[PDB]
Amino acid sequence: LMGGFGLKHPPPQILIKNTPVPANPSTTFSAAKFASFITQYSTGQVSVEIEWELQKENSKRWNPEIQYTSNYNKSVNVDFTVDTNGVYSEPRPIGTRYLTRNL
Amino acid sequence: LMGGFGLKHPPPQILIKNTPVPANPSTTFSAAKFASFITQYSTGQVSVEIEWELQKENSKRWNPEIQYTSNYNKSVNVDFTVDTNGVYSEPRPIGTRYLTRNL
Amino acid sequence: LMGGFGLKHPPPQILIKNTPVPANPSTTFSAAKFASFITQYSTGQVSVEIEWELQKENSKRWNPEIQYTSNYNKSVNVDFTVDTNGVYSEPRPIGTRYLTRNL
């Protein structure tokens, strides 16, 4: 209902966790499990690549279509670009339906 | 200066004419050339086909371009279409420069 | 909903037109398009042939079916036939459901 491609076998979930590292266990033995660990985090790059297939547009309509066009009027901030403080902002939602096929 | 492709050898001119047909020459001989012909014209289809080569657009610009878009507001006559009397009309001149390359 | 076979690729439309023939263009040149043509029409035969596939009736019902039967009573005009003035007329609509299969 939200949108997109209903799949029976979606791209599988990728779960990730830091392996816990204990911290300074006492010398004498105790059965209770460790309540204290090294405080640590991890970081690194992630690369996702998807190959899309397209349906080429083949039509005979005479007059020109509607297209998605960023307006040419001068403004303080360009759309879809960083501002002066570095905060990237999307100005408006972009639907996918512009080209016109006859019903 | 007007625009387009300066060529040293342009597509050659194609000239066409109806061959004149005399009309009822008098029996006795006269040297003066014929002043009177059958009144006739000719008609038929003409087919011109040109093969254009393109330069594909390869850019990395992040934000969206400007495109040529027919406005979606309701109007008496659609643009680039016949009117109710059958007269085809071009609403406005369309320049070719929209896509943006860095200088 | 009306009836028949929903198709995704129907038999394609066949469009036909008389090529317009101009009539007596004036000698001096004028850019405006021709407003006057020869008045002409065309005619000829058209042949459509369709190959239908059937599902043969295989049943074991003991007693006789219902069939579509033109009544044998005498009448002024036979059904599905021309009248005395030559006007072909279909007397009644003929549905396709007569043979009986068990549900």
Side-chain angles (χ1 to χ4, degrees), chain B residues 25-69:
Chain B
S26 178
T27 296
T28 186
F29 177 84
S30 179
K33 63 180 179 181
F34 292 98
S36 63
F37 297 93
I38 303 300
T39 301
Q40 68 179 22
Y41 65 92
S42 62
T43 178
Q45 288 80 4
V46 55
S47 173
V48 180
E49 156 178 354
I50 293 173
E51 177 177 1
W52 298 93
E53 185 178 3
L54 301 174
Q55 189 173 358
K56 183 58 176 171
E57 179 274 338
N58 278 22
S59 77
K60 306 302 285 188
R61 178 180 180 173
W62 179 260
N63 62 343
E65 288 299 338
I66 298 170
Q67 299 287 89
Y68 177 74
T69 293

Side-chain angles (χ1 to χ4, degrees), chain B residues 42-102:
Chain B
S42 62
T43 178
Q45 288 80 4
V46 55
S47 173
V48 180
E49 156 178 354
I50 293 173
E51 177 177 1
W52 298 93
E53 185 178 3
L54 301 174
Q55 189 173 358
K56 183 58 176 171
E57 179 274 338
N58 278 22
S59 77
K60 306 302 285 188
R61 178 180 180 173
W62 179 260
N63 62 343
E65 288 299 338
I66 298 170
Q67 299 287 89
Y68 177 74
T69 293
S70 44
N71 36 19
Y72 41 106
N73 296 128
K74 74 173 189 176
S75 51
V76 176
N77 295 130
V78 184
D79 293 347
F80 294 89
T81 199
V82 299
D83 62 350
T84 184
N85 297 130
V87 179
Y88 175 84
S89 64
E90 294 174 348
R92 65 181 180 274
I94 296 172
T96 194
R97 291 176 182 171
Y98 293 98
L99 291 178
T100 298
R101 187 194 299 190
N102 61 340

